[PDB]
Structures are given as C-alpha cells and as structure tokens.
C-alpha cells in the first residue's frame, strides 16, 4: 500500500498517469482509482494504490483517491 501523485490525467481520452518517487509513472484509469459515484480529477491529486508488475511494467490496479 503506497501513495501516488498525478503527473497529468486524460480522463476524457480514457486514461490518466500517476507519478511516484522511488517508482515510475503508475498507469491510471477512472475505473480503478474510482469509488462510490462517478468521479473525476485534476492535476495534483494524490491517490493510494498497490503497484504490481505486469507485461507493460509496474502499474496500480485498485487505486483510490487519498482523503
């Protein structure tokens, strides 16, 4: 369990990327980092997730907005 910080989001284009110190840019989509009700985000949004290792490299999967 760690925290990530948006590098930039492209929710409209169907995806957004997070960037975290000690790791690379976590791939993000408004479906995993989402939550109760349809949400959206701006730059500077810090989220919490668990990066794993898959074919395209390390990536978050069940991320969530940091409260």
From Swiss-Prot:
GO biological process: regulation of gene expression
InterPro entries (alphabetical): Cold_shock_CspA, Cold_shock_domain, CSD, CSD_CS, CSP_DNA-bd, NA-bd_OB-fold
Domain CSD: start-end pairs: 4-63
Location in or out of the cell: Cytoplasm, Nucleoid
Induction details: In response to low temperature.
Keywords: Activator, Cytoplasm, DNA-binding, Stress response, Transcription, Transcription regulation
Single annotated GO MF: DNA binding
Outcome of gene disruption: A double cshB-cspB disruption mutant cannot be made.
SMART domains xrefs: CSP
GO cellular component, one term: cytoplasm
PANTHER family: COLD SHOCK DOMAIN CONTAINING PROTEINS (PTHR11544)
Subunit relationships: Homodimer. Interacts with RNA helicase CshB when cells are transcriptionally active.
Function: Binds to the pentamer sequences ATTGG and CCAAT with highest affinity in single-stranded DNA, and also to other sequences. Has greater affinity for ATTGG than CCAAT. Can act as transcriptional activator of cold shock genes by recognizing putative ATTGG-box elements present in promoter regions of genes induced under cold shock conditions.
Record's protein name: Cold shock protein CspB
Species of the source: Bacillus subtilis (strain 168)
Lineage: Bacteria, Bacillati, Bacillota, Bacilli, Bacillales
């Amino acid at each position: 369990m760690l925290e990530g910080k948006v590098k930039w989001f492209n929710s409209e284009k169907g995806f957004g990327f997070i960037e975290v110190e000690g790791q690379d840019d976590v791939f993000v989509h408004f479906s995993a980092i989402q939550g109760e009700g349809f949400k959206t985000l701006e730059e500077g949004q810090a989220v919490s997730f668990e990066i794993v290792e898959g074919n395209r490299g390390p990536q978050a999967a069940n991320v969530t907005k940091e409260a």
